[PDB]
Amino acid sequence: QISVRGLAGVENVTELKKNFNRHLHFTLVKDRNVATPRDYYFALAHTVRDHLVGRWIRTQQHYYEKDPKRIYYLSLEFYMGRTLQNTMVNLALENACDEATYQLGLDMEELEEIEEDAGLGNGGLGRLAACFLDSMATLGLAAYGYGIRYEFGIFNQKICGGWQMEEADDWLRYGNPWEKARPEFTLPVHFYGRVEHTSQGAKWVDTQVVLAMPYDTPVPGYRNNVVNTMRLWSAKAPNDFNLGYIQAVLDRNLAENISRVLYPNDNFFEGKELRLKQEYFVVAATLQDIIRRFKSSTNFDAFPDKVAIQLNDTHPSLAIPELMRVLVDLERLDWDKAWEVTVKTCAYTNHTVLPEALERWPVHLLETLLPRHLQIIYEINQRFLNRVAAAFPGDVDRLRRMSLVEEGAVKRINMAHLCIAGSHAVNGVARIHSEILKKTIFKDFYELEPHKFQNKTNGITPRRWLVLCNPGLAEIIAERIGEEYISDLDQLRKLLSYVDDEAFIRDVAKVKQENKLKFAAYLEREYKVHINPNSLFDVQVKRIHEYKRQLLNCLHVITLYNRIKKEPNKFVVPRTVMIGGKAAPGYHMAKMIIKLITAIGDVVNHDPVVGDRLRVIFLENYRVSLAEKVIPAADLSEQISTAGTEASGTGNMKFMLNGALTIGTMDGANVEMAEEAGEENFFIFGMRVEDVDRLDQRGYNAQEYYDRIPELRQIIEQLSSGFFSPKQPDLFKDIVNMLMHHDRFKVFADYEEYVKCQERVSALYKNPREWTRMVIRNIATSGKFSSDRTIAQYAREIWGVEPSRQRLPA
Amino acid sequence: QISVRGLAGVENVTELKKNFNRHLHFTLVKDRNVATPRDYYFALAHTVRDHLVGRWIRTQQHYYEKDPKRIYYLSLEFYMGRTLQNTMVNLALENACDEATYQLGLDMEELEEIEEDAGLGNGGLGRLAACFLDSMATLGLAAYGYGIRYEFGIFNQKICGGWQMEEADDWLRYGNPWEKARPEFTLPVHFYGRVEHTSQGAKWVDTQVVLAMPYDTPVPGYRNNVVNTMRLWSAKAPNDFNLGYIQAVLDRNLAENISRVLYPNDNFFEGKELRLKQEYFVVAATLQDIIRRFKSSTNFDAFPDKVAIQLNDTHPSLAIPELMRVLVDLERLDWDKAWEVTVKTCAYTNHTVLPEALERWPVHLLETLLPRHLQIIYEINQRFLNRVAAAFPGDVDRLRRMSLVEEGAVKRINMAHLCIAGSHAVNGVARIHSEILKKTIFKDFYELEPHKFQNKTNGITPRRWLVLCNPGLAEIIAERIGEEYISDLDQLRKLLSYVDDEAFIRDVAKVKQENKLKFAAYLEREYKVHINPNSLFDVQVKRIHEYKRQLLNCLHVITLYNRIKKEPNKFVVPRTVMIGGKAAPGYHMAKMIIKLITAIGDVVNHDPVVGDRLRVIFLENYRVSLAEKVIPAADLSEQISTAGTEASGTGNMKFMLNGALTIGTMDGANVEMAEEAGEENFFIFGMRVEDVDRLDQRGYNAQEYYDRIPELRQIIEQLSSGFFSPKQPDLFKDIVNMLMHHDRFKVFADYEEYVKCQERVSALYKNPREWTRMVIRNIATSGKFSSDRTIAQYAREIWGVEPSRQRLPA
Ligand SMILES: O=c1[nH]c(=O)n([C@@H]2O[C@H](CO)[C@@H](O)[C@H](O)[C@H]2O)c(=O)[nH]1
Ligand SMILES: O=c1[nH]c(=O)n([C@@H]2O[C@H](CO)[C@@H](O)[C@H](O)[C@H]2O)c(=O)[nH]1
Ligand SMILES: O=c1[nH]c(=O)n([C@@H]2O[C@H](CO)[C@@H](O)[C@H](O)[C@H]2O)c(=O)[nH]1
Ligand SMILES: O=c1[nH]c(=O)n([C@@H]2O[C@H](CO)[C@@H](O)[C@H](O)[C@H]2O)c(=O)[nH]1
């Protein structure tokens, strides 16, 4: 059908059809008479999977032959989403499979919707790991993703009575055709026990054993025949476990609960023992696997030359003391040599400066669960502080500020300090974020070892986030500049010479209108809700959090509603405001924000006077697959976090690449996006980081804004009086109280400028031609935000390896 | 290689090899360089499985087209063992696969040993269900086996310090290539709740829901292209289950524990709630499946004409009240009509008369877990007793004896009485057993409804128990009379005309010697233990129980040892005594019997004076796969249960079919075996049932035997003094006490005759030629014990269907 989807050759279509029928018969054990849509989906999945195996086997054989330096990306989250379409795109099989299924009398798009999302992540951090794996394979790096195979991923969100309800994400229910169990590589992981100090070295004994069984999933690079591996560990009890008889067998569940479920917290630390076990479980199994592969290449001096370990946040921070344990206790290396190897092998990526998100584990927990690691951490701390004392003699406060051990109510271990001390590189995820790290929270560390600190601005993969979710846009672009940009996004700059091209302007606007019509139809199909496709699609999708300020968006929506009610027969640019995202189960305020959104919609969407001029819809169960649908249909991207709180943001990049203009604060990657496109082509507003600091020094008083802004006062009075909750007048009392007395994120402070800025947005939308020309200027300069650029920087500046765009023989 | 293993055609061997390589590549994702023996086993399993699918799909389509009466065999146990070789045998692919793997440079026998046994059963009862499925498919019946897919089957037995140690049987660890999940047929099962009586009928509400997910396994008939289905249910929690968040997800384990593990009790009732849940779980899911299939053929009058439900023991007895519940509460049929349909649909098989094995569930348990079923059971009881009262006016004691409800400490429901009342046929499993049912335990019921009682003597499948485990014997037999006997075992009688044939006599003896050499080698291979292949292989394998009297065997062994020590230089026929079997985890006496066996071996096997004249070995982890190895190598089969206790026995039939002579009591099927072969060709000894009754009436006093038999007294004194347990002199005090003061099975009473009989056995073994001629007379008359004969009788006399030997187009 479309160019960028590859060729539909005669031979290939014929081959695909016969293999599809073979799998339906032999694999699914069914015939066309009793086969269900799900049966057809699996028949197609197995058919596409077959095309991966050959490349998968030779890629790994290749690495064995060439023995290049290996990159190990450790993360407790991999937000993969669906795999079928992504695999077809990277193998250039989309059109052939589309044709083949068509001839079999089937609609491939219908079958694609049957696949469950692999929701092994919460949001940005988990998605970043997924985009990175794609880019590493596309850049020919010998990379491996290591994580946990959660039985239950992020919960499915249901909205009942306007409230969020959570239900288990049993994604493995019907089976996963993409994974391959490798029980032959099962490894033992130890817990509890005690430390014995013998003649030669310490020994960790009397431990409880839990087995780690790996499951491998293929990660195909973009049309380069490279297929890397994502290995996820599953917990298994040993057969002699607890061995009444029946009860002993049933208690196996205890040990296996380790890989049962993903903790649903986004940017928030919850110090639960089960979480600590998950963190050590992935680290312990992964390192044994790494060392095994290394020995199968005694000379640990060359370990850093053949191995690079990237820690995604502090979640896998235990890799540092665990590597020391193995080298010192098992391999018998002297401490100094072991430490040298560890530091040169490990690199750490920091993701958010919010204090409530930092991992600080109680010493009593580590003491009971990992006694040897606690001892190693104390020793690391002792030697690190000796270095600090020698560099800054007499600076006693610096010593306590930098310690890995925090004193107080309960002693805790600051995992971020542990990661900085044991890594040769520490990076932030956006220029402004990395600068904040050096200027504030890690100032002491930067002064001691300035060379360790770097910046690696985040990115997104243009495969899933353009070609896959927005084929129409990828096509009109390819028509003008070719297909090379798909793996070299910087080439999009060539589109700048088309900003005045009437044909192009018209095509860009047509693609957007088509995406909006498709999404508008989807809303009625699966969610039965009417919306006007001619309105401006104003969307904010991301996890619900106070710092992301979905509340500021709500205030604007209510402002628009009150203005309309005041002057009913006055023209206003029609808008469909869409807000979506999940709230962590125990985050009360976030759950109240969701209720507020649906409550506003209940009032606005049923007011006769408003008509189709304003609609407020809450996008239920926002996840990767839904993002792929709504982002291509958006006109306006809301990135309005308080300056200095959003480390980077990645959703913002997805919107920019798909033809939406951005309204946001100078926070995270927004700053670099505006810099790339030009501030005149971005809708910037609000306080800058410096402004926020000035306000804090002075003392933030929300009352002041309430007293001086009539429109704001009206809104707060409506909320307090029960205007949006008739049967429950004080339902939103907690929200009003927080906004008025303890708003850590200064919602009111940016209210006026935000509303003003939104007016400028509506003004531009009234001029279709100029709105589109600004869109083109955004798409044309979004190249810097490809994760291929990000990974190339990690490879050269941190891992010490060169990326390759060379194809492998298929 | 051998005739009975089919042809190794040029085309087929070529096809098998390419498909084997295809699976190793695409299915296992490996190459010949990294493939392990397990990888090769799976490659072979998937290759053979492919040959099943076509026949499986058309067999089921066939039943849909012809709509024959369906037979549903409900059992909580299906002791299947391995599936690879059995599948090749029934598809006539053994030689082709042997050749194909040979050419690939692989040993098929080595690969077959890699497959895990499907140990979803405890012993005879579970194995009977497995043999039955094979015969039903071979006889072309539209039959379905319904059970539970236990995650953990019967525990693996380890012997440590002479004691039994149990370890979890994680048989699904590496995956099961034979099963096919059918999540599309997932059904809800209800528990707890309460009963609401409305205007029209009662309603079961406020229940907890557990999902039942079916897994289908193919059951191939012998070379007739028929492939039936064994459907096993797995428990799954609903996604809204219990929906802190984390804990709610982790608590899903509670509900899913239902299908977690098989209760390891053999011939013993343990009234645990979890077991009751398993029993209802299988019954509830199965009946919904049956009714669905029935409606997809309103007219429940014809239900009994299209459906037959066979209850294997009382374990699935809840099918009766559950069928009534559905018909009355859901379909709205009047009670009388519903009862008529139920009785005509259900048939019940009784398996043992031991009182401790009878299921008698506490009313308080049924009251809380299945409130509606308890009400239905009371109503059934009320109407049944009204019938009894009318038939035997004034016989008040008969009323209390026949009640389904037992009064006393705690009220209980006698499930056997429930089954008799609600079934149109009740059968015993051996002639003597069925007679005992009518004369004793079910006398009252027989007098009320004599027509209901029948006999169906057990049998074993000649496919697994001859062709598969003893190809050498099947071959020399085929050479003389053809291959027809494999599916018509009665033809073995033709071998009687070869009893004087010198060539045949020599071949029979050669095959046995070969089997013994092979087994003797196996013992050293996997268990490192030396034995003399020239000795008489005396074996007793079956679950450890007091009624089976492994203790009587022990007394004989010790007698032989004491006699040798007394007259060292006197000649005696060499023997290797082998005893094997598992003991239920909580059965103390059985565990003590195992310890006694190993203790005897410790003394006997290391006594210089004995030499290789006597060896005592305990066969560890006795299971189906081990039975297939030891039975073909046996010379003497020990079937020595106290007369009247072994309902039938089936191991006895396996030994008779494989060339071993039998020493046993006139109990269970032993009586019919001796009758078929002729008492002169059997080694019968001990009390008959009538003798046991006389002793009980008089009062059994073990002391008498001890006082009058010097050799017996010596043995008991050795046991008491610590002769077999030096470091622990009183280790066997419990055994001696039981034998002397409360032996329910009269071990001493049969001691003298047993030892005398064993002397006659040794006398015959000294004459190779005559021993073999007697063996031939046994094999020649073992035809009656084929499960094909058993199933043909069930089909004609109970289910109302005609068996067919017609092939289906492949
Ligand atoms: O994901 C979450 N983010 C949050 O900000 N919180 C918040 O943490 C605060 C510090 O303990 C509490 O005071 C708040 O009541 C709580 O909502 C959560 O409980 N969960
Ligand atoms: O637990 C967390 N979850 C997250 O999603 N993040 C996020 O990681 C992203 C990738 O670097 C950043 O772009 C986001 O700004 C950050 O909030 C965190 O920093 N921490
Ligand atoms: O499988 C088993 N078979 C048994 O015979 N027993 C027996 O049941 C008897 C009745 O309660 C007890 O008195 C015995 O001590 C026990 O070993 C078991 O505990 N388990
Ligand atoms: O729990 C039980 N397990 C058993 O193995 N049996 C057995 O079932 C067999 C098949 O009918 C019989 O041949 C055995 O004699 C009987 O003990 C029972 O009767 N009960």
Side-chain angles (χ1 to χ4, degrees), chain A residues 707-720:
Chain A
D707 288 338
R708 325 223 270 214
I709 306 169
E711 291 192 297
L712 182 59
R713 185 186 317 141
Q714 166 177 41
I715 294 177
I716 302 303
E717 296 191 295
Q718 292 175 304
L719 290 172
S720 304

PDB file of all heavy atoms in Angstrom, chain A residues 707-720:
ATOM      1  N   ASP A 707      -6.263  36.323  45.842  1.00  0.00           N
ATOM      2  CA  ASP A 707      -6.784  37.651  46.127  1.00  0.00           C
ATOM      3  C   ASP A 707      -6.701  38.612  44.952  1.00  0.00           C
ATOM      4  O   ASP A 707      -7.507  39.534  44.848  1.00  0.00           O
ATOM      5  CB  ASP A 707      -6.042  38.290  47.305  1.00  0.00           C
ATOM      6  CG  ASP A 707      -6.401  37.664  48.634  1.00  0.00           C
ATOM      7  OD1 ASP A 707      -7.488  37.053  48.738  1.00  0.00           O
ATOM      8  OD2 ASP A 707      -5.598  37.801  49.582  1.00  0.00           O
ATOM      9  N   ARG A 708      -5.741  38.399  44.060  1.00  0.00           N
ATOM     10  CA  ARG A 708      -5.553  39.317  42.944  1.00  0.00           C
ATOM     11  C   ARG A 708      -6.057  38.860  41.578  1.00  0.00           C
ATOM     12  O   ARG A 708      -6.008  39.626  40.619  1.00  0.00           O
ATOM     13  CB  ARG A 708      -4.070  39.693  42.871  1.00  0.00           C
ATOM     14  CG  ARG A 708      -3.446  39.771  44.261  1.00  0.00           C
ATOM     15  CD  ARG A 708      -2.526  40.960  44.490  1.00  0.00           C
ATOM     16  NE  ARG A 708      -1.135  40.684  44.153  1.00  0.00           N
ATOM     17  CZ  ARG A 708      -0.096  41.213  44.794  1.00  0.00           C
ATOM     18  NH1 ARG A 708      -0.289  42.028  45.823  1.00  0.00           N
ATOM     19  NH2 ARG A 708       1.140  40.914  44.420  1.00  0.00           N
ATOM     20  N   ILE A 709      -6.555  37.631  41.482  1.00  0.00           N
ATOM     21  CA  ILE A 709      -7.050  37.133  40.200  1.00  0.00           C
ATOM     22  C   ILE A 709      -8.496  36.670  40.321  1.00  0.00           C
ATOM     23  O   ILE A 709      -8.761  35.545  40.736  1.00  0.00           O
ATOM     24  CB  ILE A 709      -6.187  35.959  39.688  1.00  0.00           C
ATOM     25  CG1 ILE A 709      -4.716  36.383  39.640  1.00  0.00           C
ATOM     26  CG2 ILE A 709      -6.664  35.530  38.298  1.00  0.00           C
ATOM     27  CD1 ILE A 709      -3.749  35.236  39.395  1.00  0.00           C
ATOM     28  N   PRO A 710      -9.453  37.542  39.955  1.00  0.00           N
ATOM     29  CA  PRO A 710     -10.891  37.254  40.017  1.00  0.00           C
ATOM     30  C   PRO A 710     -11.309  35.918  39.396  1.00  0.00           C
ATOM     31  O   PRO A 710     -12.081  35.169  39.990  1.00  0.00           O
ATOM     32  CB  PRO A 710     -11.512  38.446  39.289  1.00  0.00           C
ATOM     33  CG  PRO A 710     -10.567  39.552  39.598  1.00  0.00           C
ATOM     34  CD  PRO A 710      -9.217  38.891  39.410  1.00  0.00           C
ATOM     35  N   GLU A 711     -10.805  35.620  38.203  1.00  0.00           N
ATOM     36  CA  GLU A 711     -11.166  34.372  37.543  1.00  0.00           C
ATOM     37  C   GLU A 711     -10.707  33.153  38.333  1.00  0.00           C
ATOM     38  O   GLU A 711     -11.400  32.136  38.378  1.00  0.00           O
ATOM     39  CB  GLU A 711     -10.593  34.327  36.123  1.00  0.00           C
ATOM     40  CG  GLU A 711     -11.254  35.315  35.179  1.00  0.00           C
ATOM     41  CD  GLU A 711     -10.891  35.078  33.726  1.00  0.00           C
ATOM     42  OE1 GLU A 711      -9.697  35.195  33.378  1.00  0.00           O
ATOM     43  OE2 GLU A 711     -11.806  34.773  32.930  1.00  0.00           O
ATOM     44  N   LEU A 712      -9.544  33.259  38.967  1.00  0.00           N
ATOM     45  CA  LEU A 712      -9.015  32.157  39.762  1.00  0.00           C
ATOM     46  C   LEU A 712      -9.872  31.959  41.008  1.00  0.00           C
ATOM     47  O   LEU A 712     -10.216  30.835  41.369  1.00  0.00           O
ATOM     48  CB  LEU A 712      -7.567  32.445  40.162  1.00  0.00           C
ATOM     49  CG  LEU A 712      -6.839  31.367  40.970  1.00  0.00           C
ATOM     50  CD1 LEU A 712      -6.797  30.064  40.185  1.00  0.00           C
ATOM     51  CD2 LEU A 712      -5.432  31.841  41.287  1.00  0.00           C
ATOM     52  N   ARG A 713     -10.219  33.066  41.656  1.00  0.00           N
ATOM     53  CA  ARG A 713     -11.035  33.039  42.862  1.00  0.00           C
ATOM     54  C   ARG A 713     -12.370  32.359  42.594  1.00  0.00           C
ATOM     55  O   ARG A 713     -12.853  31.571  43.407  1.00  0.00           O
ATOM     56  CB  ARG A 713     -11.273  34.468  43.342  1.00  0.00           C
ATOM     57  CG  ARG A 713     -12.009  34.600  44.658  1.00  0.00           C
ATOM     58  CD  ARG A 713     -12.292  36.071  44.908  1.00  0.00           C
ATOM     59  NE  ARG A 713     -11.117  36.873  44.583  1.00  0.00           N
ATOM     60  CZ  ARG A 713     -11.157  38.058  43.986  1.00  0.00           C
ATOM     61  NH1 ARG A 713     -12.318  38.597  43.640  1.00  0.00           N
ATOM     62  NH2 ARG A 713     -10.027  38.704  43.731  1.00  0.00           N
ATOM     63  N   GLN A 714     -12.970  32.673  41.452  1.00  0.00           N
ATOM     64  CA  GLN A 714     -14.250  32.086  41.075  1.00  0.00           C
ATOM     65  C   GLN A 714     -14.145  30.569  40.982  1.00  0.00           C
ATOM     66  O   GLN A 714     -15.009  29.843  41.479  1.00  0.00           O
ATOM     67  CB  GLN A 714     -14.719  32.656  39.732  1.00  0.00           C
ATOM     68  CG  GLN A 714     -15.854  31.866  39.086  1.00  0.00           C
ATOM     69  CD  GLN A 714     -16.350  32.490  37.788  1.00  0.00           C
ATOM     70  OE1 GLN A 714     -15.560  32.965  36.969  1.00  0.00           O
ATOM     71  NE2 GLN A 714     -17.662  32.473  37.590  1.00  0.00           N
ATOM     72  N   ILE A 715     -13.081  30.095  40.347  1.00  0.00           N
ATOM     73  CA  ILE A 715     -12.874  28.660  40.186  1.00  0.00           C
ATOM     74  C   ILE A 715     -12.761  27.952  41.532  1.00  0.00           C
ATOM     75  O   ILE A 715     -13.402  26.925  41.763  1.00  0.00           O
ATOM     76  CB  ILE A 715     -11.602  28.376  39.358  1.00  0.00           C
ATOM     77  CG1 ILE A 715     -11.799  28.879  37.926  1.00  0.00           C
ATOM     78  CG2 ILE A 715     -11.293  26.877  39.369  1.00  0.00           C
ATOM     79  CD1 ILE A 715     -10.581  28.709  37.041  1.00  0.00           C
ATOM     80  N   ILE A 716     -11.945  28.504  42.422  1.00  0.00           N
ATOM     81  CA  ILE A 716     -11.759  27.907  43.738  1.00  0.00           C
ATOM     82  C   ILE A 716     -13.072  27.911  44.517  1.00  0.00           C
ATOM     83  O   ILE A 716     -13.358  26.984  45.276  1.00  0.00           O
ATOM     84  CB  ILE A 716     -10.676  28.662  44.541  1.00  0.00           C
ATOM     85  CG1 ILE A 716      -9.355  28.639  43.768  1.00  0.00           C
ATOM     86  CG2 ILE A 716     -10.492  28.023  45.914  1.00  0.00           C
ATOM     87  CD1 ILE A 716      -8.862  27.244  43.427  1.00  0.00           C
ATOM     88  N   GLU A 717     -13.877  28.948  44.326  1.00  0.00           N
ATOM     89  CA  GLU A 717     -15.151  29.024  45.021  1.00  0.00           C
ATOM     90  C   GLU A 717     -16.123  27.982  44.470  1.00  0.00           C
ATOM     91  O   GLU A 717     -16.922  27.417  45.216  1.00  0.00           O
ATOM     92  CB  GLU A 717     -15.725  30.439  44.919  1.00  0.00           C
ATOM     93  CG  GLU A 717     -14.834  31.471  45.612  1.00  0.00           C
ATOM     94  CD  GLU A 717     -15.480  32.838  45.758  1.00  0.00           C
ATOM     95  OE1 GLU A 717     -15.746  33.494  44.725  1.00  0.00           O
ATOM     96  OE2 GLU A 717     -15.720  33.257  46.913  1.00  0.00           O
ATOM     97  N   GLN A 718     -16.044  27.708  43.171  1.00  0.00           N
ATOM     98  CA  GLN A 718     -16.912  26.699  42.564  1.00  0.00           C
ATOM     99  C   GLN A 718     -16.540  25.321  43.109  1.00  0.00           C
ATOM    100  O   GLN A 718     -17.410  24.510  43.419  1.00  0.00           O
ATOM    101  CB  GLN A 718     -16.765  26.693  41.039  1.00  0.00           C
ATOM    102  CG  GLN A 718     -17.290  27.938  40.345  1.00  0.00           C
ATOM    103  CD  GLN A 718     -17.008  27.932  38.855  1.00  0.00           C
ATOM    104  OE1 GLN A 718     -15.860  27.805  38.433  1.00  0.00           O
ATOM    105  NE2 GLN A 718     -18.056  28.072  38.049  1.00  0.00           N
ATOM    106  N   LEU A 719     -15.238  25.065  43.221  1.00  0.00           N
ATOM    107  CA  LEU A 719     -14.747  23.791  43.734  1.00  0.00           C
ATOM    108  C   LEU A 719     -15.162  23.585  45.187  1.00  0.00           C
ATOM    109  O   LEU A 719     -15.630  22.511  45.564  1.00  0.00           O
ATOM    110  CB  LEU A 719     -13.219  23.729  43.633  1.00  0.00           C
ATOM    111  CG  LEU A 719     -12.618  23.622  42.232  1.00  0.00           C
ATOM    112  CD1 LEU A 719     -11.108  23.762  42.318  1.00  0.00           C
ATOM    113  CD2 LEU A 719     -13.003  22.289  41.607  1.00  0.00           C
ATOM    114  N   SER A 720     -14.992  24.626  45.996  1.00  0.00           N
ATOM    115  CA  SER A 720     -15.339  24.572  47.412  1.00  0.00           C
ATOM    116  C   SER A 720     -16.832  24.431  47.683  1.00  0.00           C
ATOM    117  O   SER A 720     -17.232  23.699  48.587  1.00  0.00           O
ATOM    118  CB  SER A 720     -14.836  25.829  48.129  1.00  0.00           C
ATOM    119  OG  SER A 720     -13.447  26.005  47.953  1.00  0.00           O
TER     120      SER A 720
END
